[PDB]
Amino acid sequence: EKLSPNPPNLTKKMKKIVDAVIKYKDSSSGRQLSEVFIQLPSRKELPEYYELIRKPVDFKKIKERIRNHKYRSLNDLEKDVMLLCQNAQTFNLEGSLIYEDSIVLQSVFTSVRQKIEKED
Amino acid sequence: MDVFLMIRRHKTTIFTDAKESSTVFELKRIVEGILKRPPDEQRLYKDDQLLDDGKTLGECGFTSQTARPQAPATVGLAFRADDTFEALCIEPFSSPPELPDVMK
Amino acid sequence: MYVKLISSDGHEFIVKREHALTSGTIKAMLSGPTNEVNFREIPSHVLSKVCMYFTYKVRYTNSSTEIPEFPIAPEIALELLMAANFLDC
Amino acid sequence: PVLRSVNSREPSQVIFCNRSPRVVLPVWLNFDGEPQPYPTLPPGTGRRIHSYRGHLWLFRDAGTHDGLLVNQTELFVPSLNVDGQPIFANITLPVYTLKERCLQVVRSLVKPENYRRLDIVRSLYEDLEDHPNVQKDLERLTQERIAHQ
Ligand SMILES: Cc1ncsc1-c1ccc([C@H](C)NC(=O)[C@@H]2C[C@@H](O)CN2C(=O)[C@@H](c2cc(O[C@@H](C)CN3CC[C@@H](N4CCN5c6cc(-c7ccccc7O)nnc6NC[C@H]5C4)C3)no2)C(C)C)cc1
């Protein structure tokens, strides 16, 4: 379940990045883009999702993996975040609100990771 | 209860509505305002039956269901020329052509 | 007040002015090019159906009453289309 | 510009009542404005169905996608039910123009391939080939509803 703790600064950077990504708001509408991605819908609600997506992941799972030290680098974290967004892009149509939100979230993650790595 | 009618004489057809309560005579008055012939110079028919002036269209067998806007009921009209009424004559509409090949 | 629409085969159809003004074309024919209009290319089996359409339109426009289908026999459908296109209704 | 269901999350019970002579296709505009087809209603039939406040519906002929009306308008948006009463969605024929009704009948009798073999002005070929279509109507309705906020 819970792996052996990471060094504290690594964990702190992982939390600051995912926090900023989750909080991110559309500059003009103020809509927080992560809302739909926080928790996967039920197998009941969206059974096609689980037939179509082999490795489901949501932000609640990503935070759990930070806390439990499943990621050993920002690269491990980045892979899970890009997998979340890629899954959104596989399941939904190009041009859908959820598809386009997932594109913006990739570039939010990248921007935030760069800003936070730079911070000493 | 509105009935939708075609009053037809020869090659003339009048489109009008009337109440099921309104009478044959009142209809003749409508015809008189249009075709300038007084009621005593008209006979109105439902099929082959001469209609009585005092009858409501309801009593003549016209109903809202059989006298619809998109499918009006026919009343025949015969005029008195000099001493006597003409034989009821209603000229048929033209025949449509044969269905074109692509519509069969 | 009534107007008279005359088919190519000389059938005279008398309808309420209001019903005939369903057609923008007829509106114009009445205002220059009496209370009578000749259609040299619309036969009585087409023009009678147009007049029935006027009745139907005026009765069921802005009405809560359940609206029945306007019926067109296959055999008149092409000529009725040509007439509706000309009359703009 | 997008005409679309709002994810209100608030259930609303509706009766779809077919008062038309057509097989009726209910069409649900999803949260991205995309039309989704629902089970059809034969003429003379109604159904109690579960929807949501602020969801958007239109209704068409299931076979041709000819436009139909719902409560005398093109769009139906369920509101909150009061006193356990469903909202009635009364589906009726419009008063088509004579020309549109003639185009329907000719389209029903003639394959698109054969439209151009009919003996009629060229502009009528174009009128026939302009088939009733939900996406094309959504573009018109989207423009119409700007003024309705
Ligand atoms: C018999 C008969 N006859 C004539 S007609 C008829 C009839 C009539 C009705 C019905 C049935 C009973 N009723 C209906 O169909 C009604 C009608 C109309 O009102 C729509 N609707 C519905 O039921 C939709 C509906 C459901 C819903 O519930 C929300 C509260 C919440 N949902 C919204 C959309 C979901 N989203 C969930 C995340 N999901 C994604 C998540 C992710 C993702 C998340 C985290 C991490 C990574 C990820 O990739 N990615 N992609 C996603 N894609 C989609 C999104 C969907 C939640 N509100 O409306 C139904 C159909 C959707 C039957 C017959």
Ligand SMILES: [Cl-]
């Ligand atoms: Cl559809």
